Enzyme design. Sequence first.
Site, PDB file in Angstrom:
ATOM      1  N   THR A  15       0.606  43.292  20.860  1.00  0.00           N
ATOM      2  CA  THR A  15       0.116  42.855  19.568  1.00  0.00           C
ATOM      3  C   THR A  15       0.590  43.824  18.482  1.00  0.00           C
ATOM      4  OG1 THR A  15      -1.826  41.984  18.384  1.00  0.00           O
ATOM      5  CG2 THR A  15      -2.181  43.988  19.719  1.00  0.00           C
ATOM      6  N   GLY A  17       1.771  44.080  14.013  1.00  0.00           N
ATOM      7  CA  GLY A  17       1.694  43.508  12.672  1.00  0.00           C
ATOM      8  C   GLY A  17       2.956  42.733  12.334  1.00  0.00           C
ATOM      9  N   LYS A  20       4.152  39.671  18.345  1.00  0.00           N
ATOM     10  CA  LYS A  20       3.195  39.700  19.461  1.00  0.00           C
ATOM     11  C   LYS A  20       3.769  39.080  20.748  1.00  0.00           C
ATOM     12  CE  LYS A  20      -0.184  36.430  18.012  1.00  0.00           C
ATOM     13  NZ  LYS A  20      -1.139  37.083  17.054  1.00  0.00           N
ATOM     14  N   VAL A  21       3.784  39.868  21.822  1.00  0.00           N
ATOM     15  CA  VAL A  21       4.434  39.469  23.068  1.00  0.00           C
ATOM     16  C   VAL A  21       3.481  38.733  23.997  1.00  0.00           C
ATOM     17  CG1 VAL A  21       5.954  40.186  24.949  1.00  0.00           C
ATOM     18  CG2 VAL A  21       5.770  41.603  22.900  1.00  0.00           C
ATOM     19  N   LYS A  36       8.737  37.637  22.963  1.00  0.00           N
ATOM     20  CA  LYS A  36       8.339  38.269  21.712  1.00  0.00           C
ATOM     21  C   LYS A  36       8.232  37.159  20.693  1.00  0.00           C
ATOM     22  CE  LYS A  36      10.926  41.237  19.097  1.00  0.00           C
ATOM     23  NZ  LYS A  36      10.672  42.596  18.534  1.00  0.00           N
ATOM     24  N   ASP A 128      16.262  54.846  17.221  1.00  0.00           N
ATOM     25  CA  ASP A 128      14.838  55.039  17.323  1.00  0.00           C
ATOM     26  C   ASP A 128      14.388  55.131  18.777  1.00  0.00           C
ATOM     27  OD1 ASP A 128      12.143  55.148  16.204  1.00  0.00           O
ATOM     28  OD2 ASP A 128      12.030  53.227  17.339  1.00  0.00           O
TER      29      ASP A 128
END
Length: 314
Positions: A15, A17, A20-21, A36, A128
Amino acid sequence: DELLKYYELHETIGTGGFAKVKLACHILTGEMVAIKIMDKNTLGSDLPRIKTEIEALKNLRHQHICQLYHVLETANKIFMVLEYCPGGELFDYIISQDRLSEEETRVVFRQIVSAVAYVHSQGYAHRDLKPENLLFDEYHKLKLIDFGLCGSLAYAAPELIQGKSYLGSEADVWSMGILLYVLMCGFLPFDDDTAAALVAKIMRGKYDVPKWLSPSSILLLQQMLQVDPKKRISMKNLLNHPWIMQDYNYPVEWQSKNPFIHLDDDCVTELSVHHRNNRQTMEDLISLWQYDHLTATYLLLLAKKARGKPVRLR
Ligand SMILES: COc1cc(O)cc(Nc2ccc(C(=O)Nc3ccccc3)c(OCCC[NH3+])c2)c1
């Protein structure tokens, strides 16, 4: 969530912003999958951020990078179907163990190094790297996820930090240095409450060095975590660093161990009987590599065949 007449959705496990998977299951193959699910209305003009991710992932195939099977765009949703990784999280693993043995961090780092070296060879940088981006499959092998490239300043290289021009690869090796640190110690080498005192610490480039770190570990940290990117260790040199090879005395094998070369006949055969059409035209259709449902179905039969299961659709 409508065009998905390809998948039986199960439960949520991610979950955000942004997205959400959900666990799902590929109807035709039986194979388990992760989806996803994004909101384009949340992205706004972060479509670029995701479409450059997707084209990135379309070009990647590595044993330690989460495989992209399928993309679907509806009026206001983007769905990425991804390799199922039921082993758990690298981060949570680290906190559950407090810190990993030197010999366990080595085994794992070699996997990270494998993924990233392959990424660079294909002309990209991850930009990242972090524990939250590494998943485990059921054989506890690492899958690098979530390409995308807010604030992983903790993991950001100093020259990245300060708007300087930079090489992605040299950036990544910095971040791998930080990761290494946190695998072996269980906390970040640079840390503070606000962002400003954090950035200050990075720019100075010196960190606490717990009693338990070995002479070799302490060494490699130094070579990776150089502020001056001239002085940071190249990937070239990481691949066969003595620490890297201290336990298994072979260089990291970064080249894709599962390369896409020819199409697999069996999969092409099952896809041919199922789609009541001939071999040439089924190759032609798959070779278009659209990452549509056929590309999903193909990639999943391939994975079914690697498990030594019969190569069949239902
Ligand atoms: C390139 O791979 C990507 C890109 C991206 O933007 C996001 C992700 N995220 C994923 C992918 C797969 C899983 C997964 O398979 N998890 C799982 C499976 C079974 C049981 C429990 C978890 C995933 O898991 C959620 C972890 C992060 N919220 C995230 C990959």
